Amino acid sequence: SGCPNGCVRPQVHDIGIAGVKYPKVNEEKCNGCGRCAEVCKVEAIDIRGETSYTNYNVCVGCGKCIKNCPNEAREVKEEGYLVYVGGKTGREVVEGVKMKLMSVDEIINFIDKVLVVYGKYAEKPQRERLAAVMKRVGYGKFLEEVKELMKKEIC
Amino acid sequence: MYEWKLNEIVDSGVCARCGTCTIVCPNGILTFDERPKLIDECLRKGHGMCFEVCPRVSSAKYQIKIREKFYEKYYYAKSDIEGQDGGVVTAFLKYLLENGKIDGAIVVGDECWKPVSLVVQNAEDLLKTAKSKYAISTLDALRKAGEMGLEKVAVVGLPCQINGLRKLQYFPYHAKHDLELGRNGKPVKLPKIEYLIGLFCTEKFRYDNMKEVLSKHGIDIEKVEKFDIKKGKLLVYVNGEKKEFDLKEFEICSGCKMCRDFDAEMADVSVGCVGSPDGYSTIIIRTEKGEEIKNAVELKEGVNLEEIEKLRQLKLKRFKKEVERRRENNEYVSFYWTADYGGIGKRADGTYFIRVRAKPGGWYKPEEIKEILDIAEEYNAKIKVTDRAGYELHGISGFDVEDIVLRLREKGLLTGSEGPLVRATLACPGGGNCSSGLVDTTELARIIEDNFKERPAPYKFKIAISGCPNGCVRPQVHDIGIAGVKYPKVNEEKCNGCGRCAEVCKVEAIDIRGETSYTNYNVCVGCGKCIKNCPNEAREVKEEGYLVYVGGKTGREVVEGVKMKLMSVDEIINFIDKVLVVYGKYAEKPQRERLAAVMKRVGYGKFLEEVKELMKKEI
Amino acid sequence: MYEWKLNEIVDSGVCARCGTCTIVCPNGILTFDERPKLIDECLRKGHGMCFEVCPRVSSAKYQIKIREKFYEKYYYAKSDIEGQDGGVVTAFLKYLLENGKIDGAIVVGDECWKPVSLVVQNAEDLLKTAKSKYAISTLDALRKAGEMGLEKVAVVGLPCQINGLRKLQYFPYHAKHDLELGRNGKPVKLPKIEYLIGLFCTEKFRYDNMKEVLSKHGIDIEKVEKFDIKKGKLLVYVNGEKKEFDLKEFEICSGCKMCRDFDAEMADVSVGCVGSPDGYSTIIIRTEKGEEIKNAVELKEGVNLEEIEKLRQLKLKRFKKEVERRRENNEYVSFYWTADYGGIGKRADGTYFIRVRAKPGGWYKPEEIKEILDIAEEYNAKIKVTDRAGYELHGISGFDVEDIVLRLREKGLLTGSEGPLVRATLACPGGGNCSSGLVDTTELARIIEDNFKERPAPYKFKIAISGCPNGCVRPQVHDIGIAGVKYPKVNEEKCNGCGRCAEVCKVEAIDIRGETSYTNYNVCVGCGKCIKNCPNEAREVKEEGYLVYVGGKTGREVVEGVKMKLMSVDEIINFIDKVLVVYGKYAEKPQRERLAAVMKRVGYGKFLEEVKELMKKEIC
């Protein structure tokens, strides 16, 4: 997905990627015009007097408030590709776990390692999806092995 | 030089000079005489409500029309009141005030023929405003009515003014948020616009230009008794004499050349001169509010429909000529009319994309795909396929959007599945196509499309039909999800414990024990594979049909829909309709609240209880 | 008139006249000379951070102390600088300014002995403030330092002022929200208080009262060279003579009679006169910031601890006398000291409830329950049992809260499991008690309680230990959940397909086929019933241990914890500690963000990979 609107459903895919751009407010430029709160679909912004704030427990990193600020008071706090793992749909819905921001090389390494650990622990081909194998061995055990194999990668 | 986003619309000359942008400002820092003007610095630099209500930024006609569901009833009439023609507009306003239908009337008066926006609460004061002012008018009195605290008002306006006021009424559906808050944290004070009376319109002029041109011909504007526009000529009645002037002698406002609306097509009732005899006014009723004019005047049938259509075409030809002239001279063009159609979006590079509403089941005829291919090659547009099995043409110029939509419409390819309405229904091949299909999905998708396609809703509404419990089109995360199911029961006389059924069960719900088999109904998803693949026909259908889910969604957050029950096709159609009615009744924030959010806020029990009550009343 | 919530504290005379409430106002509508005053209408009617920082509304000492982890190191010293005693406070401030430890010093100067709060950025200007002003002082210069844009400052204050400033430092932990926003939508501009230097204190007086009492004795307050308090008398040095006055001659501030803090127990370093020779200052170092005093003055051991404790007891006796007097005369009392203890809450009717931190496994000795029963009958309090297997005594008067807490403490019944800290660990009977128990839960709960009981965190933190996968204590919706698991494997040589194991499986994960049995590991929860109940011993242990979950929560919203892996007891203790460290590092909103919210915001992968990195680094 190019942004957090998840048009291609990154949260219910074996591996989901979503573009994110989190904001930070520059108090010297912000004047409390109130425009950013209008472009926020999740309503994560608070306009108070001559400034603005962001609730980071609600903010999804759509970056609309940075793009649409007429005074350029909103800057990029964090940016990149947010990754999810273990999502699935079909007979049952399983929400993928939010991992972290990853570089393209990290994403390729991560996809490869997840497939290696998935293949190593899968017991029932054509029945067990990644989510089922992750749940059975444990997300912590599964993901810590994925990380160990990622560190070993030299190509 | 106070920065103001709408300056591009005003400086380019695309501005209709309607004055809608200035009456909505919650800080009152905008003024309008013959053009918009900032009297103080805007902290947003005009990035607010003024830009969002502008009918020349975006018409927003598609989203307003599907909700207003305008119709056309042609009549003509005359009243005892002396007016521009039959005095119908004044007679209707007098009736609305007398019968307590409005607290006040927003009308255009004049001082030496210089227009003045007025709030009229007395029927006797209405007569002074009963004549056409061909100089630029404002909507300023609507703001005064708000400061006064008037609850309901009727507004007379030119097509451009009606368009801006319709954008104000349906603000969240196109703006995607609520009215802008001022410095005091409150939105603008405006009365509810109960009636929108539109006038037929060909053009308007600057007051000083009219006065100057009249002065050149030895006429003092202040002495003029009446004005009129007939067959491309301005009639001036002065000192008991009639003077004819060519309209080209006066300087037409640049925005009028960029206008497509002649008869004020979005008004509750439109009043004009064309198509009716002298001394009468043509009347086009389009809504139930406009119908009230039948109590104010005696309606007569026999309107000349061809004369009205000839003017519509002349105005459209003038518009096309102006748009072509701007293109050739590299002048700024705002493609505001692109919002007259569904399935239109703006790309990051400035060009447009046209979305073809996905066909039921993702099945496309060769004739249909060939048309999309021909357009793509002709306009050098990229072809995109959507995850709802729809098509999108990318890289379309604003000059070609309308031509492509109408060309696609002729071949049955309606553009849609965009905005706060029912999106394209997603169905899998299902029964008859897929070997796992248990129910028909193509005909059910066609029935749902025929009953709800492009239906307005507080926000996007997506329906998915699956042929079996594998949910390829995700019924569990759709506003309404349908899944074919076939639950098994074992016939002990025929079952011999061969063990074949347990192998075809992906969820492993079956137990093979000795000479029989069992099913764990807490695991069984009703795929019916064990019934189909039993070599001894020992498994039979226990229960069968369409399993329904409601309140699901995806996007920014995932919400799983609630499993309802098996439903018949008629029940499904009734259910979809009633879920939309209860969703619309309880939604508070259009373009932000999905069905799941409204269901969660009012409660699933309360919401679904009402859906059932409405379903029972249908029958 | 203009309504102000703190008027009850001020009008009753409980007010310490510390001036903390007025410096925090983001609208600057509060001023302080000798008592708080509104110079403009407050839209909140004083329902804001002026009331929330007040040390007389609530001390908030328990939540501040568990975070500051104060200790006590006694020393005495003298410096070259001439001061009230050894001039230690000025020598320390001079050192901090000279070595760039602070941008400025918040000190009390004077004009005719009328105290003046000052911002000092130069050492030469420090000498003018090196002397005790017994008239009411303010903290006004801290607001000036903020307007100046100073980043770090050192503040000298009386115990009451230190208490209010500690409440400002730990604002979110007791206020439950962030600093109040003014009309401009911004919080008060104040510098970071890097050092809090506390003074020993017995009392303070109104300036005009001091001046009038001295004038009546023929002494011009301007002519006075120095003041001093010793042996219940006020020494006045004027014209080369020491003129003694009884402290009763002057009118002690009513708030001083309600004071319990003599040695400024919450300061980074406390400086006083008692317990050290004349010309020296007693020094009590309590934090690593206070330790920096060793570089400013030559510390000497040999402080008379008994003299300091005598003063503490005299101040506490005076406090108890004043509280009893108010009770007998039906005067208003603010039970601000109830926040010195854990497990204290205020009921809807105005009385208090005392929460006994639940004992591990919900097991209570008869002596423990009998003590709770004796207290309930003596004070006519209602006995409540909590869903974490704790006890609560309801209907306690503010006058008896402290007595009950200390009485409970003597019998080993710690009051707690309240506030932003690690709550009582919830464990089921488990192994050895419950027939479904697979692991020991009672000893694990005791180990977790010994290592993390009442540990401060950004918000409440709850741990649950289940003996088997039935999750009686809900491990899947706890910040950290532990569940005993025992997964099976079938021995085909011993299995004969009798079918007994499928009957004991609640999840129906077993398949009986001919002369053997199978297990669906996507359904199996590891209850181990099939191993235990196999009559032919055909089922063996495949995997066994403590299954761990993290990021679970209940309350306003339900959040399911993520299944990690099997962990050893040492691994569990290391994991709980690391999760708390990473939770504290990334938490932005104390008393609002639970672990699950912080994990979701930074990402589960990023959060857990840091927990793992810190776990590998652990050597103890």
Ligand code: SRM
């Ligand atoms: C084209 C498509 C992506 C694709 O590669 O296929 C798409 C494209 C856009 N989506 Fe979408 N969405 C598309 C299917 C989806 C789906 C999946 C579905 O509907 O089958 C989702 C999540 C599923 C759901 O919503 O139930 C989806 C979640 C969104 C959201 C988040 C809405 C929400 O409730 O969270 C937005 C923005 C908004 O509504 O605020 C959005 C908005 C958009 C817009 C129009 C952005 C915008 O606001 O202007 C994107 C147009 C870009 C473009 O060039 O097309 N799009 N979008 C899909 C069009 C299918 C169609 O023909 O209708």
Ligand code: SRM
């Ligand atoms: C006594 C008890 C209920 C009971 O009948 O047993 C209780 C009582 C209160 N809880 Fe609780 N909570 C109690 C267990 C819980 C639990 C379950 C648990 O801890 O096992 C939850 C949800 C589980 C969880 O939080 O993970 C719970 C969720 C809350 C919340 C909302 C928590 C959240 O993050 O959403 C608050 C208020 C807040 O935190 O803002 C709260 C706050 C309170 C307060 C202190 C109200 C307050 O904000 O001051 C209540 C004290 C009233 C009184 O008279 O005791 N209480 N509270 C439980 C004390 C157990 C103990 O000894 O520690």
Ligand SMILES: Cc1cc2nc3c(=O)[nH]c(=O)nc-3n(C[C@H](O)[C@H](O)[C@H](O)COP(=O)(O)OP(=O)(O)OC[C@H]3O[C@@H](n4cnc5c(N)ncnc54)[C@H](O)[C@@H]3O)c2cc1C
């Ligand atoms: C600038 C202009 C151009 C027009 N062009 C055409 C045309 O090309 N073809 C056609 O058939 N009809 C046109 N009309 C409409 C026509 O002139 C009559 O106004 C209409 O038929 C109603 O007549 P009536 O006697 O029923 O109205 P009346 O009873 O006389 O009431 C007239 C109403 O018009 C309103 N009004 C007058 N001037 C303005 C203005 N500038 N802006 C907004 N409201 C105003 C007044 O407030 C009043 O309520 C035009 C009107 C205007 C104002």
Ligand SMILES: Cc1cc2nc3c(=O)[nH]c(=O)nc-3n(C[C@H](O)[C@H](O)[C@H](O)COP(=O)(O)OP(=O)(O)OC[C@H]3O[C@@H](n4cnc5c(N)ncnc54)[C@H](O)[C@@H]3O)c2cc1C
């Ligand atoms: C009102 C009052 C009562 C006291 N009562 C006792 C007591 O009963 N027993 C006891 O042992 N010690 C008491 N002290 C502490 C004692 O007076 C000395 O201030 C302390 O020993 C430090 O002296 P010094 O020479 O080391 O500091 P110095 O080098 O003299 O520095 C003194 C510091 O105290 C600050 N200061 C002075 N007056 C005030 C004030 N009103 N509020 C806040 N800061 C102030 C100055 O700004 C300066 O930074 C009291 C102090 C005060 C102000």
Ligand code: SF4
């Ligand atoms: S749009 Fe920009 S200037 Fe306006 S309130 Fe938001 S961050 Fe501040």
Ligand code: SF4
């Ligand atoms: S980045 Fe998006 S979700 Fe976050 S505060 Fe800005 S507009 Fe809202």
Ligand code: SF4
């Ligand atoms: S305050 Fe709002 S409505 Fe007024 S000019 Fe500015 S952006 Fe436009």
Ligand code: SF4
């Ligand atoms: S077209 Fe109307 S709303 Fe738009 S800028 Fe012009 S006067 Fe304002």
Ligand code: SF4
């Ligand atoms: S021609 Fe169009 S822009 Fe001009 S006044 Fe008429 S409706 Fe408005």
Ligand code: SF4
């Ligand atoms: S949902 Fe079922 S019937 Fe439809 S395509 Fe998928 S497997 Fe086939």
Ligand code: SF4
């Ligand atoms: S495939 Fe048919 S006959 Fe064989 S065990 Fe299953 S239900 Fe019985």
Ligand code: SF4
């Ligand atoms: S209908 Fe499908 S899910 Fe149910 S027992 Fe048969 S094969 Fe399994």
Ligand code: SF4
């Ligand atoms: S504005 Fe806030 S800090 Fe100031 S007096 Fe009012 S409530 Fe207290």
Ligand code: SF4
């Ligand atoms: S004790 Fe201190 S913070 Fe409280 S009201 Fe008095 S001066 Fe203000």
Ligand code: SF4
């Ligand atoms: S005795 Fe000292 S610390 Fe206590 S209130 Fe009085 S001045 Fe403050």
Ligand code: SF4
């Ligand atoms: S979690 Fe298991 S061991 Fe503990 S009480 Fe419940 S059934 Fe018994």
